[PDB]
Amino acid sequence: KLPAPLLQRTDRVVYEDIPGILDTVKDLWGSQFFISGVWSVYCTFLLSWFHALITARTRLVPHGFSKKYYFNDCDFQFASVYLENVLATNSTNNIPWAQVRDHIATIVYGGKIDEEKDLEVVAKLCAHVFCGSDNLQIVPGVRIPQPLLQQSEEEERARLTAILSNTIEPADSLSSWLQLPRESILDYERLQAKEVASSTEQLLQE
Amino acid sequence: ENMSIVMNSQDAVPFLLDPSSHMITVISNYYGNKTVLLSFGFVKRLENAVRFGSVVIIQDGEFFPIISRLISREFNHAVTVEIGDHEVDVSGDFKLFIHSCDPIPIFLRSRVRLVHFVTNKESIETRIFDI
């Protein structure tokens, strides 16, 4: 609680940034400059997509999670450094995807989470993003092919940015892209409109 | 009309219940250097101010009893006021005020000229009508 006299003789604004998934992926990708081969850049791309997806899923309080968490840039830095260290100590290109999956789900992102339900939510999203399979359908529209073993990192950054530019964000991105049922986000919209209408009723009967 | 009621009271000591501390500032500006501000050796400085003949303003009205003779105007003429344990002369220019900023014993309530400053929906109506 800030003091009342400080909050009185001032002009107050309340801000709301875009919850768009693709905008957050683009911001994370543009803020990153990658440097270790092509796989570090590929894993940074995967981590940016995962962080944007989990931050978008956080905003839906009753259905996306069970509470309101706050995953931020420091958590992204910790995960990125863990991927860099995993790629550095394992240069035989047999990447321990189980290691990064469990470490990100349980220690990096799931450290602050006490309830179990949110923990297998994070575990499911980690399993989807960091599956390490040949074909990766992150969302039902776009795919991220793995880097090939005859090129450099600049062309990989260009290719992933080109994949970003091709992507279009539909209006139902809060349920199709987050692997949520449509009835769940419909119920969330119903609850927010219900609390708004009920509060207007209480403010109107006075 | 609040100021008129305050300064048209020659028999009872006026009361200034002002939460914004604006009345104390305006009366200090009005009186200049003669304003002696106190709150609840305060008895000794009250006696010295009474002997000198200086206007005294006392804050914290909710914490009001040693000034009972002065608030009731019970003087002995031979004009002498017996404050504490010693009779003290009065120069005649002495005026007393009481201030409070927390919107009280019944003796304090029914012995002064209470003046109140408050804003409400009626004040909102009056202000917007004036505008």
Binding site: F78, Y82, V86 | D11, S68, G84
Partner: protein
Amino acid sequence: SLNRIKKFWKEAQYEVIEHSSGLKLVREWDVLEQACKEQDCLDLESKLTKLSEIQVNWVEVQFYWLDLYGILGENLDIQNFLPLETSKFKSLTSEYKMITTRAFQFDTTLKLTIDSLKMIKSSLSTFLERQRRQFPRFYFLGNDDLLKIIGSGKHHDQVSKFMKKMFGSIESIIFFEDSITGVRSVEGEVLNLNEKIELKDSIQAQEWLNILDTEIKLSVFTQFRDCLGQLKDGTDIEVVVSKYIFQAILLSAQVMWTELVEKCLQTNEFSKYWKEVDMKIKGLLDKLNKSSDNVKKKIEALLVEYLHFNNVIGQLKNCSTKEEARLLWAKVQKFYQKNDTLDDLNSVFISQSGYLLQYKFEYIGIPERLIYTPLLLVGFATLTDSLHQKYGGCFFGPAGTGKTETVKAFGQNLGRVVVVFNCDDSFDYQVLSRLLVGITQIGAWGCFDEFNRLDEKVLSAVSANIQQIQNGLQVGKSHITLLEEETPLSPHTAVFITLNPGYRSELPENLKKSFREFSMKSPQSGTIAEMILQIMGFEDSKSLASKIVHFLELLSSKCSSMNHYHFGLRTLKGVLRNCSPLVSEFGEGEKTVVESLKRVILPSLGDTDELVFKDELSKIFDSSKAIVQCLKDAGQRSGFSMSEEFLKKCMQFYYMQKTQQALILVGKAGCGKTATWKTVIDAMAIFDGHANVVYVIDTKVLTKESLYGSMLKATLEWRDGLFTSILRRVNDDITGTFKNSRIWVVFDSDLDPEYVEAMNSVLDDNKILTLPNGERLPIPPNFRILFETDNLDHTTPATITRCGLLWFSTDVCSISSKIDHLLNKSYEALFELDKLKDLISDSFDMASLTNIFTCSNDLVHILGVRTFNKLETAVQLAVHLISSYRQWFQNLDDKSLKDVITLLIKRSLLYALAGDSTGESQRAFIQTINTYFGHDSQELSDYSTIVILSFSSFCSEIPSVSLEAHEVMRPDIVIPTIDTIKHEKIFYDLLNSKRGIILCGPPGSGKTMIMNNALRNSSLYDVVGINFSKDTTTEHILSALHRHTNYVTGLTLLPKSDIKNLVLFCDEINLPKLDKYGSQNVVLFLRQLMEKQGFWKTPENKWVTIERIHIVGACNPPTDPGRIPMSERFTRHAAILYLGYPSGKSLSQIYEIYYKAIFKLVPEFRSYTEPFARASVHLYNECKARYSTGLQSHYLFSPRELTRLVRGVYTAINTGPRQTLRSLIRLWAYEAWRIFADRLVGVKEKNSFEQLLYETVDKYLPLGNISSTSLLFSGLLSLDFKEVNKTDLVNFIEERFKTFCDEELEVPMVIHESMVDHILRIDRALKQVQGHMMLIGASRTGKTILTRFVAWLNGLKIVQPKIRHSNLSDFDMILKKAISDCSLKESRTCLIIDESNILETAFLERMNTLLANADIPDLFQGEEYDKLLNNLRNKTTEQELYDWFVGEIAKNLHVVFTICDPKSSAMISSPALFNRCIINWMGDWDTKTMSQVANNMVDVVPMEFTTIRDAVVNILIHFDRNFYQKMNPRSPGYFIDGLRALVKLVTAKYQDLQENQRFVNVGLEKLNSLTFEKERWLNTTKQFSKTSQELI
């Protein structure tokens, strides 16, 4: 004022109270500072400011010289430490001596002195700073420990005691022939240094401590290297367990395990190394079964680690693929060692989840090794992740979930000691930041245990420091700038935080951005218990651990939600720790676990909880007489009886104090706690053979300053408290008694939070006491604390498991068993003895007594004491009655003796069980008693009494005393009736029976009266009567006992007399209010005197035995306002009697005796005494029955009103003329109206009283108008109290009012009929004996002015106290001056007290006692009392002198109370204020009074010029009614001020208008071009009338 200040400074001196020489010392700083707080004025102000600076220098110079004499006046090594520093302290000593000499025998010199004192303190601060920079492990200590260590230069001692504080895991230094060969760990382990540390006389402390610390690190490394090479050479671990310290074997085994598991993980081979590890575990277990204690600890810790190794290898073997095996191996801590690095101490690194950390080779000892659970390894992983980027590891979750222990285990595995901040309110900022900087500079790890328990300011202040540390670590900074110094920042430090959010707050934002939080809510209590049981040697450990965890879960889920229930992991580990001594007897199996669960958990459970425990124990689990026999023998020695419950609780307490050093016994009062632990202690003394010394200390009676000890605000000299004194006396053991005897300290009172905050560290694992002076007192193993409570409402959950808890859910006895024990004890308190004992014992036939007790519990008992606790009163009363009648028992038949014994037992039962009930309930109970014994025995009736031996009755004893006329003024004259004699007889029996009495009853029931009648006519007892108040202390009782008791050795308290026992009458014991923690000091003090017969002296700590002092009480029922119920632990020690209002027959008898006494003055109507008695009694009875307290708070009536009526009629007859029958009747009616109907609500109620009085006269006294306004009585217009005429009365009072207004004050009062009637009434009430006023009237109704006028007319003198910043000292000084003037001058006083001057209820209680008596005893004591007696002797038997003093006060004192609003509400219902002060209802003004006042005041203002007056008065009164009904009495202050302002404004405005009219007329005459002026003048003259009407 200047002369007084100069004289005070010239008289300023010093007191010789110090030790040795030192400085001369000063006391009473506060008075001197309060006294201290144009050229002459400027000089005086400069002198005062300089003096304040000098006193600041003075207080600071003894504040510094405390430590300076501690380290310099008794230790020359500090002052001779360094050469330049030696010269500096020599100059210090020279300056000290020179300022001492000039203080015994200057302004600039003393300014230079304080400047030099600041300089030398700064030099000492930087010297300690340099000492701390040389050895940064000094910086964990306080200043005094540093001074002691640096003074231990060539002594090599006392630096071996603080190394637990400095090093964390070192107990002591070992040294042989002035050389060091190692250190001792806390667990007793010895570390063998590689080479001896050679020591000479020319050595510095920090130098050899640096060598010792680096050599400790190198020696731990060397032992690790030797053990690692030996284990690499194929040598088994079973031979090297006993060779090196635990840390070396730990690290070597971990390195070998990591290397071997990686080598076997490169292929698919795990069974071989798994079998090797399992064989090592089995060999270690076999060696543990037959090893010494240090090897036991070593093998226990190695077994923790080897079970971890076995678990990891078993997890790795079951992996299907190599990828998941590599995943599982990457999650555990991995230990490696470097090879290329020639640096020894940085050669070992530790890998977890990919990242790497460093082993630091610090010595740790054998810590309690945490069991390796997967959650523990995940906590290790997240701590590693936080440390790898120089962040901070944070932990949050519920309380007691394994956070601080996880941080400590991480530190232990990484080869270092984690210094733990036990964060609470005790840690202030300077020590916390100091130990933070120590952890920074060393490189140690600081775990902030319970970080959410800090205060807000300290949390922010240290959050800034932790943020600075973390920001320095993150960017690789070298120095951090905190605490105004650029201290070094070692890059190996860290900060951990464990907290509990919302229990509280979360991590602050500035620390939230630098840390990495983690949630670890659920420990695995299954695998922890399994590994602990496997270590302890149980054959079946996994299934047993699962059973224990399941059973604890069922107890946590099924049992009740009591606060003291903890079924988590700490309780489980306590059970497991307690299993092993039971393993030594029962064996390794299920029986040991079951019996340990019974010994640990079952004492803390209730009754239904006990049934749940037994049911679940039978469902889950399948399933010494020497101490039982010794307990039975000790109980039969002590008189107790071994019931099954009592024996069970005794065995539980004995087996539970076997292990726990401090127990809590909880149970309802009277359940048997003290008997339990006294029996157990006696049996242990008989069985073991050790002597036992016991001490009982009630906690709440002594304050904490008296319990522990505190400084002096002027001298700073430590004084030992009681607990510190007894602990020091058992620590020293001067005589040698306390070397082979168990010592107990029983805190036989209620737990208190603020008291146990200083007890927690005493109860901590350190067994150390924290004192303000710095002394640390150890606790021996045989120093066991005991607690004895009845509730745990304010006990924190930190001490329910730290201290042992034993729960007494029910009584340990039947009623018959306690009856038998009480009988035997009372017999032992005493050829006739054996037959007497047999008769008293067998006359208690339990078959009828059971029905009697079950029929006595149901009746309505006031101050409800349980049926089990009336047995002491019943048995002791019966035994004392028979022992009093034993003299004439040898010459009576068995039938008559049996009947007499039966009657006395019936009387004891009736006055014990239902002595605390109403009259009708007493009749019902005596009917039950007569029924259940049978009709063959003697029937105890309502009035049966035994006279010497025959049946008698109380009705044939009462004396018909004939007091004369003028003894109705005396308030202590008791008219004896049947009830008074009955109550005095039962009071004598209960007093002589060595029992306390409580006299519960309504106000005016006759509690104090029957009390002082009983022990004023007695030659065997004396009274020290006390009236209690809201603010009562223990010292009040001692002050009351000061003049009646003497100290004899003081180890014993005896009365000053030699033949009469002393009785401590304590009236109104409900007044002591509860403290902030729900307890009262005075009633616990009373409980201490009545139960234990003695008390602890507060300045000397000695047991002052009570021999011949009794305690009785008399208090109103707790349902009344302003009263607080007392603890039953005290009231169970006092027999409770109930005193209701006397019946109509007794009332009529008493008041016909009073009317005979009053009509001896007028003998012509001597035959009409009885109808007057029935008149008064019937009038009061109707005034009570028809008028209840639901109408007003002052609708209370008692016999006090009848006595006041009799006194008023007496003073009116005495001060009146010759009286006819009609004059007598009208005088009685007028007096009844003035006493009773001074408070009735309306005119309707007063008319109801008038018709009641008319009916009373017509029924009893066979009449003119007798209203309040028709019986106009006065004595101002004549020489006697008679009916005077209204015209002359009003003329006289108006002339005297004119004299008053022209002589004393210029008050513009308005005279009216209500004012005349009320000044008449107040003059009447001030014309009596003991006249005081409770004037109920609204503000500005003329009450104070009327009182002053009446006091001026009657010749009284006026005093009005100046009551801010005034207290009882000034109030009593003013009252002493006033009473001295009254005694030495016969000057009748009118002491004015307003409701604005009653600030504290202590003033009210002072007047309350003043009006209970006609004086107060404790106002005059000592020198003032001697001076008063001398003045009485000069003006005029101590009893006769005090009686005359009481009489002259009661005749010559009139204090008045002015109240507007009826804190002051309890004054009205207070009984002793209700005694003589007359409550006058002034009333708020009505329409008639308002109109009359307005008409009288505005009549002197010309207004009839525009009738007007009545119309405007009606307007004003009706608008006042509308205002007060559209906006409690309604004040006329607004009304009177409005009328006054209107009067002055009309006069001034009419004068101004007259001047304007005169000027206009002059102008018109001068003017008489002109046509316009004439027209304007005509228009003005036409409009003038409307102008005047508009003006008004």
